[PDB]
Design a protein around this motif. Structure first.
Motif, PDB file in Angstrom:
ATOM      1  N   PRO A  55      43.456  89.701  92.328  1.00 38.03           N
ATOM      2  CA  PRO A  55      42.741  90.411  91.252  1.00 38.03           C
ATOM      3  C   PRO A  55      41.249  90.101  91.208  1.00 38.03           C
ATOM      4  O   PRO A  55      40.829  88.945  91.304  1.00 38.03           O
ATOM      5  CB  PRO A  55      43.441  89.919  89.974  1.00 38.03           C
ATOM      6  N   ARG A  56      40.455  91.156  91.041  1.00 39.17           N
ATOM      7  CA  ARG A  56      39.025  91.056  90.772  1.00 39.17           C
ATOM      8  C   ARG A  56      38.799  90.747  89.290  1.00 39.17           C
ATOM      9  O   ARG A  56      39.418  91.367  88.418  1.00 39.17           O
ATOM     10  CB  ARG A  56      38.340  92.374  91.155  1.00 39.17           C
ATOM     11  N   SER A  83      46.697  82.951  91.105  1.00 40.26           N
ATOM     12  CA  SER A  83      47.769  83.721  90.477  1.00 40.26           C
ATOM     13  C   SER A  83      48.899  84.042  91.453  1.00 40.26           C
ATOM     14  O   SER A  83      50.011  84.352  91.012  1.00 40.26           O
ATOM     15  CB  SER A  83      47.214  85.014  89.865  1.00 40.26           C
ATOM     16  N   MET A 118      40.030  87.835  82.151  1.00 38.21           N
ATOM     17  CA  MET A 118      40.916  86.727  82.485  1.00 38.21           C
ATOM     18  C   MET A 118      42.232  87.234  83.062  1.00 38.21           C
ATOM     19  O   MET A 118      42.619  88.393  82.872  1.00 38.21           O
ATOM     20  CB  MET A 118      41.170  85.836  81.257  1.00 38.21           C
ATOM     21  N   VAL A 119      42.910  86.337  83.788  1.00 37.07           N
ATOM     22  CA  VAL A 119      44.213  86.596  84.394  1.00 37.07           C
ATOM     23  C   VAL A 119      45.209  85.598  83.823  1.00 37.07           C
ATOM     24  O   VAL A 119      44.999  84.386  83.918  1.00 37.07           O
ATOM     25  CB  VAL A 119      44.168  86.482  85.927  1.00 37.07           C
ATOM     26  N   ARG A 141      54.376  89.045  87.411  1.00 36.49           N
ATOM     27  CA  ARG A 141      53.757  87.839  87.935  1.00 36.49           C
ATOM     28  C   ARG A 141      52.440  87.517  87.237  1.00 36.49           C
ATOM     29  O   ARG A 141      52.087  86.338  87.121  1.00 36.49           O
ATOM     30  CB  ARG A 141      53.547  87.981  89.443  1.00 36.49           C
ATOM     31  N   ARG A 142      51.718  88.524  86.744  1.00 34.29           N
ATOM     32  CA  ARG A 142      50.429  88.272  86.096  1.00 34.29           C
ATOM     33  C   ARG A 142      50.027  89.465  85.241  1.00 34.29           C
ATOM     34  O   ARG A 142      50.174  90.613  85.665  1.00 34.29           O
ATOM     35  CB  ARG A 142      49.347  87.990  87.139  1.00 34.29           C
ATOM     36  N   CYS A 143      49.508  89.175  84.047  1.00 34.40           N
ATOM     37  CA  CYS A 143      49.001  90.175  83.111  1.00 34.40           C
ATOM     38  C   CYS A 143      47.501  90.372  83.311  1.00 34.40           C
ATOM     39  O   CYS A 143      46.737  89.397  83.347  1.00 34.40           O
ATOM     40  CB  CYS A 143      49.283  89.734  81.668  1.00 34.40           C
ATOM     41  N   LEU A 144      47.079  91.631  83.432  1.00 36.05           N
ATOM     42  CA  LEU A 144      45.664  91.969  83.555  1.00 36.05           C
ATOM     43  C   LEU A 144      45.193  92.775  82.353  1.00 36.05           C
ATOM     44  O   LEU A 144      44.242  93.562  82.448  1.00 36.05           O
ATOM     45  CB  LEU A 144      45.387  92.745  84.848  1.00 36.05           C
ATOM     46  N   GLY A 145      45.853  92.599  81.210  1.00 36.43           N
ATOM     47  CA  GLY A 145      45.449  93.335  80.027  1.00 36.43           C
ATOM     48  C   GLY A 145      43.991  93.169  79.601  1.00 36.43           C
ATOM     49  O   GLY A 145      43.484  94.002  78.844  1.00 36.43           O
ATOM     50  N   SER A 146      43.297  92.139  80.066  1.00 32.95           N
ATOM     51  CA  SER A 146      41.921  91.931  79.616  1.00 32.95           C
ATOM     52  C   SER A 146      40.870  92.585  80.513  1.00 32.95           C
ATOM     53  O   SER A 146      39.679  92.535  80.190  1.00 32.95           O
ATOM     54  CB  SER A 146      41.631  90.427  79.476  1.00 32.95           C
ATOM     55  N   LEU A 147      41.274  93.234  81.606  1.00 34.73           N
ATOM     56  CA  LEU A 147      40.321  93.875  82.502  1.00 34.73           C
ATOM     57  C   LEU A 147      39.823  95.200  81.921  1.00 34.73           C
ATOM     58  O   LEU A 147      40.611  96.015  81.430  1.00 34.73           O
ATOM     59  CB  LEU A 147      40.968  94.109  83.870  1.00 34.73           C
TER      60      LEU A 147
END
Ligand code: HEM
Ligand code: HEM
Ligand SMILES: Cc1cc(N)nc(COc2cc(CCN3CCCCC3)cc(F)c2F)c1
Ligand SMILES: Cc1cc(N)nc(COc2cc(CCN3CCCCC3)cc(F)c2F)c1
Ligand SMILES: C[C@H](O)[C@H](O)[C@H]1CNc2nc(N)[nH]c(=O)c2N1
Ligand SMILES: C[C@H](O)[C@H](O)[C@H]1CNc2nc(N)[nH]c(=O)c2N1
Ligand SMILES: [Ca+2]
Ligand SMILES: [Cl-]
Ligand SMILES: [Cl-]
Ligand SMILES: [Gd]
Ligand SMILES: [Gd]
Ligand SMILES: [Zn+2]
Lengths: 400, 402
Positions: A3-4, A19, A384-385, B31-37
Motif C-alpha cells: 500500500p501507498r 502489512s 495509515m494502514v 489482511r489490512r484496512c485502508l479506510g483512511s486513504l
C-alpha cells in the motif's frame, strides 16, 4: 500489493511493507469497511514464529542458541501441552505487543516498559500484592513510569487468572428511581458486582471502586485499595476560580486490567499494564462524553456562554477550558500528563522510526486522531494502514 | 449475519443489511484496512442498467408493473442496437439524487431529496457550457439563500471526447507560486492557477482572486471564461467581539460547487456534472483557513489574541481555531448567506441515518470524513459506528483531464 501511504500536509510518500506480515484477519472486506467498529498442537507454529522474531531481533538468527530453544519448546509442548517463556522472551513479547497495538498513540515509548514477572502467582491475595506493587512503582509519587505485570498463562484443564475490573482505578456509578447515574455511568455494571460480592457502596461522584480479583477455579475476592496508594488530581482552572468548586477530580494512573496478552501462541488473561494519560482522555472523553460524566453544559453555564444556539460554539469553548483545567491541574500536582499536540507529534516521530525499523506501522486512524482539534494535529493529515501483528493485546469475553 | 453497528452514546444496535448489495469493491481486505486513504462492454452495462431501472420503479412504488417491464425491454433493445442508451428525464433526476444519497463522505445528505436537477444533455459547445454554469451559480446562490443544485452535461459516448470542467470547484481562489517557494493565495490551487495563466488568463496578485473557468468541449482544448463578479458572492470575515479580526482582510465565497467528479447512473457516465450545496463552517474555518498547507492563519490569530504560543499545553491552537470558526459563522449570518455549523450538521446526519435504516436497512458512511475536524467527540456522529461501502448511482473521482 504494497500500500501507498501519503502525508497530505507535507506530500511525502512511503510504502508499508510490514502489512504483508499480518498474521490474523481483521474485519474488513473488499465489499465493506468496518474500521470504525470498536469490537469488530498448532500452538507450535505460533511459538516457532515468535522465536524467530526474537532471535532476529537480537541479531542471532539461526545460531546454535536459536536451534536449541526451538527443540526446547517442541519437547515442552510434547510433555505438558504448553511451554514456558524465558524471562527475556517474555520481556520482548510484552514490548512487542505494545509496539504492535494499532490504536495506541503513545507507542514512541514502547522500548521503555517495566515488565513484572508474576507467573509464579497463586491465590487472589497474592494478585493483590503484585497489583499493589505495580501501582506503587508505576505511580512513583507522580513521576509516572510504564509497566506491566504478567500473571500465569492460561493452560488446559485449569481455570484462569482474571481481573474483573476493566481498569485498576475506576470511579463508581450508582442508579436511582429517576434512572440517572451518580458517578461514572461506564461503571454501573462492575459497581453492582462489587456490591453483590460484599462491597459497601459509597454515595459520591468519585468513589474509587474495590478490586474484584479471581484466581483459577474460585469465586473472585473483594480487595480495597489503600487510599494513600491511589494518586488523585483535584481539578482547578488557571483563571476560572469557580472551576475548583465544581469538585471535579481524576486519578493519576491509567492502568488497563481486562485485556489478554498473546505471545507466541500463549495467552495471558491477566496482564495489567499502565502508562500515563493524554489530557484529552480525561478532559474530553471521560468528563465530556454524553454517556460519561457529561459536564459540558455545567461548565458552559458557569462561563456564561450562550447555550441555546449551536452556532455560538459554546460546546467547543467549554471543552477547551476543561482540557486546560486538566493540563494545569496535573502539572500543578507534578503528575505526568501529555497534551494531544505533544502526543500526536511524538507519534509522527514513532511512524518515521518504525518505517525505518521495519517498513511500516499498524495504526488505527480513528483512534490515533484526538477527539478535539483533530485537524490541528499532524496525524489527521497522515494516511495509515491498520492490521494485526503478534505478539498482541486483545479484548476478551468478560469472566461472567 | 450482516454487520452489527452500535451507537455508544445511546447503546442502540442496528444491522446494516444494505451493505450486502454493494457492487464496486473498496480498498480493504481481511489482511489490512485502508479506510483512511484519501484516494484508494454490453453485458456489464445491461446488468447495471437493469438494476438502476429496478431502483427507479421501486422508488415510485411501481415495481413489476407494465411500465416497468416495458422500460426494461426498451433499454435492452437500445443497448443491442447502439451499445448504449439514454436516460428518461425522470430517471436522470432520480439518479442524481440517488448518487448524492449514496455518497459515503457527505454529512449533508439529510437534504438529498431536495436537489434541483438541470438537464444540460443537449449542450454542444464550451460557450453553451458556460451559460449553463452561470445559470447554475445564479440559481444556487439565490442572493445568499442557497439552494442545492446539479447540472448534468452530455454523457460519455464512443467516438467523441468528454465534456470536462478542469477546475475542481466552480469558485476557487488563485494560488500564485511565489518566487521564494512560498504561495500567495490558496496553496491547494497552484496547479489549476498555473494552467489558467498558461491558457491566457492575466493573473492578479491578491490572496483571494477568483479563478476563471477552463471548460472543455469534446475533442477541443480547454477554453477560458471569466466569471462575472456579480455572480460570485463572497463574505468578508469579521469576529463578533474581536474587532481587529476584520483588519486581517479575510474572505471566503458563498457557494461550494464541486465540478471535477464523475456522475455514474445505470452504467452511464457523466464526466461533467457540477453540483453545489452550502458550506459547513468547519470546512472554511478549520480546514481552508487553519490547515498548515492552506491559508495557515492559526498562529497569526493566536498571537493577535495574545495567547502563549511557546507551549502546546496552553491549547492556544484550539482557542484560536475556535474563534476563527466563530468568526466564519458570525460573518455568513451577518451577510445573510446560508451556512451550517458542525453541531447542527452532524445532528441532522444522525436523523438521516435513522431515516435510511428504516428506508433501506443501512447507510454507507465514511466515519473519518463525517466526523468534523474540530470537536469530533462533542458531536454525536463520533460515537456512531459506521459501515463504508459503494453503491450506484454514484459520484466518483476521475483523472485530471490534463
Ligand atoms: C505511556 C503513555 C501512553 C499513552 C499517552 C497512551 C495513550 C493511549 C490512548 C490515547 C489510547 C486510546 C484509548 C482510548 O481512547 O480509550 C491508547 C490505547 C492503547 N494503549 Fe496506549 N498509552 C500509553 C501507554 C501504553 C502502554 C504502556 C501500553 C502497554 C504496555 C499500551 C497499550 C495500549 C493498547 C493495547 C491500546 C488499545 C486499547 C483499545 O484498543 O481500546 N499503551 N493508548
Ligand atoms: C446541502 C448542503 C451540503 C452540505 C452541508 C455538505 C457537506 C459536505 C461535507 C462537509 C463534505 C466533506 C467534504 C470535504 O471535507 O472535503 C461533503 C462531501 C461530499 N458531498 Fe456533500 N454537502 C452538501 C451538499 C451536497 C450535494 C448537493 C451533493 C451532490 C449532489 C453533495 C455531494 C458530496 C460528495 C460526493 C461528497 C464526497 C466527496 C469525496 O468523496 O471526497 N453534497 N459534503
Ligand atoms: C496504558 C494506557 C495509557 C493511556 N493513556 N490510556 C489507556 C487507555 O486505553 C484503553 C482504553 C480502552 C477503552 C475501553 N472501552 C470500553 C468501552 C467499549 C470499548 C472498550 C480499552 C483498552 F483496552 C485500553 F487499553 C491505556
Ligand atoms: C456540495 C458540497 C457542499 C459542501 N458543503 N462541501 C462540499 C465539499 O465536497 C468536496 C470537497 C473536496 C475538497 C478537496 N478534497 C481534498 C482532500 C482529498 C479529497 C478532496 C473534494 C470533493 F471531491 C468534494 F466533493 C461539497
Ligand atoms: C464508534 C467509534 O469507533 C468510537 O466512538 C471510537 C472512535 N474513536 C475512538 N478513539 C479513541 N481514541 N478512543 C475511543 O474510544 C474511540 N471510540
Ligand atoms: C489522511 C486522512 O484520510 C485525510 O486527512 C482525511 C481525513 N478525514 C477527512 N474528513 C473530511 N471531511 N475531509 C477531509 O479532507 C478529510 N481528510
Ligand atoms: Ca419512580
Ligand atoms: Cl480512562
Ligand atoms: Cl472548500
Ligand atoms: Gd455570574
Ligand atoms: Gd472587543
Ligand atoms: Zn477498512
Amino acid at each position: 500489493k504494497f500500500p501507498r501511504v501519503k502525508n497530505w500536509e507535507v506530500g511525502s510518500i512511503t510504502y508499508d511493507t510490514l502489512s504483508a506480515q499480518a498474521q490474523q484477519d481483521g474485519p474488513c472486506t473488499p465489499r465493506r469497511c468496518l474500521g470504525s467498529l470498536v469490537f469488530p498442537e498448532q500452538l507450535l507454529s505460533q511459538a516457532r514464529d515468535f522465536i524467530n522474531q526474537y532471535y532476529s531481533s537480537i541479531k542471532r538468527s539461526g545460531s546454535q542458541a536459536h536451534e536449541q530453544r526451538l527443540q526446547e519448546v517442541e519437547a515442552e509442548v510434547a510433555a505438558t501441552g504448553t511451554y514456558q517463556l524465558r524471562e527475556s522472551e517474555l520481556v520482548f513479547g510484552a514490548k512487542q505487543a505494545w509496539r504492535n497495538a494499532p490504536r495506541c498513540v503513545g507507542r514512541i515509548q514502547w522500548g521503555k516498559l517495566q515488565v513484572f514477572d508474576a507467573r509464579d502467582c497463586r491465590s487472589a491475595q497474592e494478585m493483590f500484592t503484585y497489583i499493589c506493587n505495580h501501582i506503587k512503582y508505576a505511580t512513583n509519587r507522580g513521576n509516572l513510569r510504564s509497566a506491566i505485570t504478567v500473571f500465569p498463562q492460561r493452560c488446559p484443564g485449569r481455570g484462569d487468572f482474571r481481573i474483573w475490573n476493566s481498569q485498576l482505578v475506576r470511579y463508581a456509578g450508582y442508579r436511582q428511581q429517576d434512572g440517572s447515574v451518580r458517578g461514572d455511568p461506564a461503571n454501573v455494571e462492575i459497581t453492582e458486582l462489587c456490591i453483590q460480592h460484599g462491597w459497601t457502596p459509597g454515595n459520591g461522584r468519585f468513589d474509587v471502586l474495590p478490586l474484584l480479583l479471581q484466581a483459577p477455579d474460585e469465586p473472585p475476592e473483594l480487595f480495597l485499595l489503600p487510599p494513600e496508594l491511589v494518586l488523585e488530581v483535584p481539578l482547578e482552572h488557571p483563571t476560572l476560580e469557580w472551576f475548583a468548586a465544581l469538585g471535579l477530580r481524576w486519578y493519576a494512573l491509567p492502568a488497563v486490567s481486562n485485556m489478554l496478552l498473546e505471545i507466541g501462541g500463549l495467552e495471558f488473561p491477566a496482564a495489567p499494564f499502565s502508562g500515563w494519560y493524554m489530557s484529552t482522555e480525561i478532559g474530553t472523553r471521560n468528563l465530556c462524553d454524553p454517556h460519561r460524566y457529561n459536564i459540558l453544559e455545567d461548565v458552559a453555564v458557569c462561563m456564561d456562554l450562550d447555550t441555546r444556539t449551536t452556532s455560538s460554539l459554546w460546546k467547543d469553548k467549554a471543552a477547551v477550558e476543561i482540557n486546560v483545567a486538566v493540563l494545569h491541574s496535573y502539572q500543578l500536582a507534578k503528575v505526568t500528563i501529555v497534551d494531544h499536540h505533544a502526543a500526536t507529534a511524538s507519534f509522527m516521530k514513532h511512524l518515521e522510526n518504525e518505517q525505518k525499523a521495519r517498513g511500516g506501522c499498524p495504526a488505527d486512524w480513528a483512534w490515533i486522531v484526538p477527539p478535539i482539534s483533530g485537524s490541528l494535529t499532524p496525524v489527521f493529515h497522515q494516511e495509515m494502514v491498520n492490521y494485526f501483528l503478534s505478539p498482541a493485546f486483545r479484548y476478551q469475553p468478560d469472566p461472567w
